[PDB]
């Protein structure tokens, strides 16, 4: 609006269960480095450090509703908003064939 940006925030929590011989069907990417010098502070435009750079059409994540550009908020009950990339990758791998994840999709109206 006249006083600042307006956004639509859609929160999606999904349970992904994959087979051994497949991936969850997405590529995770960090939007910024995580340094211990200063905490990442979330904003509506930039709600988390990790996001879905791409999602395989027809894959597990896709069928559950995850989409390219979704920001990762939680992995298996743990907040990942401020967490660096390798650590988040480890947390996801810790679950094996099961991944519970909350994401947010942000659009500017
Ligand atoms: N587009 C793909 N699904 N490629 C394989 C997955 C790679 C991804 N970094 C995980 O692991
Ligand atoms: C977070 C990543 C380790 C997920 C992996 N690329 C997969 O599709 O299974």
Element (H, E) at 33: none
Best mutation site among 14, 26, 57 for ligand 2 pocket (most ligand atoms within 8 Å of CB)? 26
The residues pairing with 100 across neighbouring beta strands, listed in sequence order, are 15
Does ligand 1 lie within 6 Å of residue 56's CB atom? yes
- Say if CB 49 and CB 40 are below 8 A apart: yes
The answer to whether residue 2 is domain-embedded is no
**How many angstroms separate the CA atoms of 65 and 18, rounded?**
14
**How many angstroms separate the CA atoms of 63 and 31, rounded?**
24
Atom 2 in ligand 2: residue holding the nearest Cα: 89
41 HSE (CA, 13 A, CB side): 2
Task: Give the chain's domain count.
Answer: 1
Provide the residue range defining the domain that includes 31: 7-108
Residue 44's alpha-carbon distances to 11, 15, 18, 81, in angstroms, are: 12, 24, 31, 12
* CA nearest to 72, candidates 12, 7, 32: 12
- The three-state secondary structure class of 82 is coil
The answer to whether residue 84 is domain-embedded is yes
CATH number at residue 72: 2.30.42.10
The method recorded for this entry reads: X-ray
Q: What is the resolution of this structure in A?
A: 2.1
- What burial letters (b/e) apply to 60-85, b meaning 16+ CB within 10 Å? bbbebebeeebbbbbbeeeebbebbb
The answer to whether residue 18 is domain-embedded is yes
């Amino acid at each position: 609006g006249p006083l600042g940006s307006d956004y639509i925030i859609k929160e999606k929590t999904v349970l992904l269960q994959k087979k051994d011989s497949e991936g969850f069907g997405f590529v995770l990417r960090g939007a910024k480095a995580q340094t211990p010098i200063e905490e990442f502070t979330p904003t509506p435009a930039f709600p988390a450090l990790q996001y879905l750079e791409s999602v395989d059409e027809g894959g597990v994540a896709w069928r559950a509703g995850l989409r390219m550009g979704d920001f990762l908020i939680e992995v298996n009950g743990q907040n990942v908003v401020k967490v660096g990339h390798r650590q988040v990758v480890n947390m996801i791998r810790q679950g094996g064939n099961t991944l519970m994840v909350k994401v947010v999709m942000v659009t500017r109206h």
